[PDB]
Design a protein around this ligand. Sequence first.
Ligand SMILES: O=P([O-])([O-])O
Ligand SMILES: O=P([O-])([O-])O
Ligand SMILES: O=P([O-])([O-])O
Ligand SMILES: [Mn+2]
Ligand SMILES: [Mn+2]
Ligand SMILES: [Mn+2]
Ligand SMILES: [Mn+2]
Lengths: 477, 477
Amino acid sequence: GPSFWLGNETLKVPLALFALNRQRLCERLRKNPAVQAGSIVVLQGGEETQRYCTDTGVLFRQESFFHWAFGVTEPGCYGVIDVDTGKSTLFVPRLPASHATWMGKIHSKEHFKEKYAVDDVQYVDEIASVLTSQKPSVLLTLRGVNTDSGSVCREASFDGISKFEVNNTILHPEIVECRVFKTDMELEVLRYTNKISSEAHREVMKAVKVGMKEYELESLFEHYCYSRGGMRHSSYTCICGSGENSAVLHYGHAGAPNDRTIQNGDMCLFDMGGEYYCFASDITCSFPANGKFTADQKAVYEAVLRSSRAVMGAMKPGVWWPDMHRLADRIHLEELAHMGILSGSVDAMVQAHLGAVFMPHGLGHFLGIDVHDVGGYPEGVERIDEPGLRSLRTARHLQPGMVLTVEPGIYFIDHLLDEALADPARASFFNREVLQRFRGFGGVRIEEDVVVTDSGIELLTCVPRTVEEIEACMAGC
Amino acid sequence: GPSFWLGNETLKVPLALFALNRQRLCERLRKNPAVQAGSIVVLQGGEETQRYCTDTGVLFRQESFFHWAFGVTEPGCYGVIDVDTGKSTLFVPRLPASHATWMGKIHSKEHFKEKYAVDDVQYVDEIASVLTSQKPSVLLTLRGVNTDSGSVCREASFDGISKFEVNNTILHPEIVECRVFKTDMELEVLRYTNKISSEAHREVMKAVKVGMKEYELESLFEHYCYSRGGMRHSSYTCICGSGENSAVLHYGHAGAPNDRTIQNGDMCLFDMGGEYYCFASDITCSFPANGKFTADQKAVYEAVLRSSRAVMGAMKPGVWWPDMHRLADRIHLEELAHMGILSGSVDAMVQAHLGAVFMPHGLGHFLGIDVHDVGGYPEGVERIDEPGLRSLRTARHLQPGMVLTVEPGIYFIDHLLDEALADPARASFFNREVLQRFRGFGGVRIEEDVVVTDSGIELLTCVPRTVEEIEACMAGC
Ligand SMILES: O=P([O-])([O-])O
Ligand SMILES: O=P([O-])([O-])O
Ligand SMILES: O=P([O-])([O-])O
Ligand SMILES: [Mn+2]
Ligand SMILES: [Mn+2]
Ligand SMILES: [Mn+2]
Ligand SMILES: [Mn+2]
């Protein structure tokens, strides 16, 4: 059996992985009472892209659904799967012999059959003819709404498609459910992205110096992942927040691109995750820039370590994800009170929604081929209309084989804080004189990637977490 | 006067650079008799994009024309220039006061006026009424054909733009012609991009070892450029061909993603250039993987070194660029004859277009904000319909201020070789028994970036070039 491999110490991923996904999608559609006999799944791969109107090629990364079904790295492909038999056909672009002048050897269709271990390979321009000869009942295409972006997924289309019966509602929720439940072969890849990203995080912690620019660490992190782990891409733009910037969720975008000089006294919050063969990792480490936690940083950090461990210790099949988020809120509030920042009844603090002031984002989300993976809110799973909870990327109950991030945080965000101090239903909880000490603290977030097993979780991530472990990693070790 | 800067040893670029561009564009438009008084240039900035239908951010890189004119790093902006007066107005998006949580500091309009040194800043939702009160005769927008991609530039559009008179033919030829001639400020940025990429090429040469994967060198090059040079993007996808892949012109892309193991005996061809503040560099180095040229490798290498130095020596205002391409072709053929690969009259070889068998691409191209920069083929300049020369990205005569790549090379491409050996008008020049030993040699390209001065050229790139220099570099002398 063939495998994708970037050599050295990188992971061998069997193409069988994708055969299993195809097989699981078919099994799921045969069980579907409204999937007609003789149906055929028709997916379209992503295409080569350029910067606006220039000839500057953009690096091609495969469309995620298409990758999940076939594992194909080349642009311009299509893929069909006969539902009743499970037979797979890949369609590759016809490159004219003259292209060998600027390409290498132009690969034969047979080269692609053995590469991807699919049942047949044909040219893209013969798609209409090839599907005609199969006399299918219906073409199942991919159309639906991603619940993190709001975008509608592009449906496959080819010249001549109008002569076929096309159903575009059935496939989306089904191919999404398959993706939510990771196979053992998929887990092996997620273990590997986490291992490599964990090593990269360790290296950053070793190298950080007061005086460096944040992007120096971004650069180091991507160099390790690529050179040591074959990860050409990151799963998302690196967030390298130091000082006040640790309080900016999604910092490091074009408008704030990791350009701050790290200073003595700053907390660093680093959320960086490499991507191997279109599989994600998503890992955040928080640590003092100088290698020594102050009392205040120890206190806030250990509050987050506490919610992290309490959530992970409680996760198991049947657990409603929003319950864990509320747990994290409660623990934050408890500890924020133990440290003297808040006073009064934790119950009262909860009933007021104070938790959302300190952790305005969701506790965690599905992870897979996308960092924010599909299937958090299928039909019938409602968004909870409350501050904090409304940002959860899923409201599902945990089941074995799900892959989630566990990412609690405590931040000191000036405009959430000024709001609470202006709301008489929230103001009384604050001790202004101690709060003043934490203005500009930034934030801590501790983000693990876990798998939901039959009875608990498997922790994918391996970074130092306790105060002791972190101060030791930063000093060598 | 304010400047773009990324700290450390990174280059300070004065925002005055872009004011000069706006000034120069206006002066050229004023001379154009089709341009009506009261005309306003309206450019639209690039927007934030995501991976297909997911919420995975793609790192924002500004549209080229817009950057040339304003140097704005933020997504979602417009920018207008009053032709008669030269006053610039930047339009920035109105971000709801309520998501400082996720963005950070919502910057006021004065911040941006200060930041970019424009005459005025307003919100984007106000663009129709801001323009309406200026009572323009005509809006000049940007539409044209890029002569490398064949793509049509996206013309600026906003809500209520159909109430204006809009012209979309005048601007493109004029803004392109300004981009062709680099100001002293632009040149300073280009010296820097070349300095940094040259330093990185030197590091890639000291680091190359047999048994490494090509992408390890790509990763290091990029890491030097980012951590050491502030270059978050490269100018194009790194080409790291070794062995037979050094003969593959479009190498490095998704379908051949630098995944070959560097072998003893291989030639390497590394084409890589970092990008700083959307300014490009374009450098190719060629060298033996093991750090030592064989006789065959030296002969071919010194053939390309010869034509590189000949072309650079010849360049001056007034020189027709296709004559330089021809001069490279003649030098290659001379050397390939001295080597025994060819026999007979070099004049006859030239008449038969045999040079394009060994160098199928153009000698070089304008370089600027884009690596294949705009303006090689404006009205009245035609593509020469002959092998090799048809691939030239410009057929213009050289003038002070133009920046070009000089990138001759020799490759052994089976498709081209086989075609030529079947043609009795070309076959006779080959010594097949000598040609044999060079099959699967790969190729060598030597690529320098230069500026045309009043009297000749200025060389920007600073890498090892002679056989002695390269071997001494690789041995870690
Ligand atoms: O970014 P995130 O990971 O979702 O928090
Ligand atoms: O799982 P669920 O919760 O039923 O969605
Ligand atoms: O890529 P290139 O440099 O244009 O050849
Ligand atoms: Mn994260
Ligand atoms: Mn996450
Ligand atoms: Mn190049
Ligand atoms: Mn070039």
